[PDB]
Each structure stands twice: as C-alpha cells, then as structure tokens.
C-alpha cells in the first residue's frame, strides 16, 4: 500500500519507481491530490478503481467529476453512506458515472 | 429589527436569506462572533465648564 500524500518534493520522491511492474499493489490518494496531480494517475493504468464517500462526487458539473470520469479503469466501485438521501439528479449523475 | 434585514428577507434572494440565517446562527452560537461586548467606560466631556 502506497500512501500518496505530502509536499511536492516528497510527493515526487514517493512517485519515484511507480512505473516499474509490481512496484506496488494498491495506491490510496485523496481527491485534492487527484485534482492536483491528475496527469500522474491518468498516465498509469489502475485496474480496479474505488471511490469512497461517493457523495462528494455528487455534482457532475464539478471538474473532479469530469477528471474522474476520464480516468481509464477496468472496474469501478463507488462507496458512500446513504446516497439515497440525495435528490434524484445526483443519483442519475452517479449512475452515469 | 433592522429595516434593511426586513428588506433583504422581502427580496427573496435565496443567497441573501442563507446569509441572514448564517448571521442568526452566529449570534446564537456566541455573541462575540456578531459583536464583541463593548468594554463600558465613562462618557468624556470635551472641556469643563
């Protein structure tokens, strides 16, 4: 498990070696760094992708929603507590994702 | 009481009402947020008679 967080110098130090086969099994990253560092994650291929707290995805108009949608993935899993609380529109957005 | 507040409410600008609500919540949560309790001191006359 690679915890991809920190200031840019250590962040890129943590990037070092990511292209090697089996360099790591799973990478966990925060949505702020996904919107920050989108190029790095998009270049790599990420097999099965999971999103926790999918309620944050809710607005398809957000740039992070678009970025996440562009990311090439083999399978996708969306995890959120109780999305049904939300207006239908957000549910449609998620299903479209 | 402030008439401008009433006018704001009348406007129906959802944002303006949201802001008003925020100000109400701030007032309820602790008065220092809305207005620090003024440190009371004597009135000062400019010059003695």
């Amino acid at each position: 498990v690679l915890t991809y967080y920190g200031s840019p110098q250590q962040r890129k130090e943590k990037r070092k070696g990511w292209n090697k086969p089996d360099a790591f099994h799973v990478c966990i990253v925060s949505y702020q760094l996904v919107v920050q560092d989108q190029h790095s994650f998009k270049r790599k291929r990420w097999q099965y992708m999971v999103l926790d707290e999918a309620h944050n995805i809710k607005n398809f108009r957000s740039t992070r929603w678009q970025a996440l949608l562009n990311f090439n993935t083999q399978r996708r899993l969306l995890l959120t507590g109780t999305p049904l609380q939300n207006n239908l529109a957000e549910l449609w957005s998620l299903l479209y994702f | 009481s402030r008439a401008q507040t009433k006018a704001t409410l009348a406007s129906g600008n959802f944002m303006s009402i949201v802001n008003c609500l925020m100000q109400l919540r701030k007032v309820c949560n602790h008065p220092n947020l809305f207005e620090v309790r003024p440190i009371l001191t004597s009135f000062v006359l400019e010059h003695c008679v």
């Binding site: 609380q85 939300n86 207006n87 957000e90 | 129906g12």
Partner: peptide, 15 residues
Amino acid sequence: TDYFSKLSVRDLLGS
C-alpha cells in the same frame, strides 16, 4: 435534498 429547500423562507421563519 429538496427537503431543506422545501422549508420555504417564511416556513423557516415561521409566524
């Protein structure tokens, strides 16, 4: 989500 918006301005204020 409507629920909170369905409480109209005067419905929030009350009487």
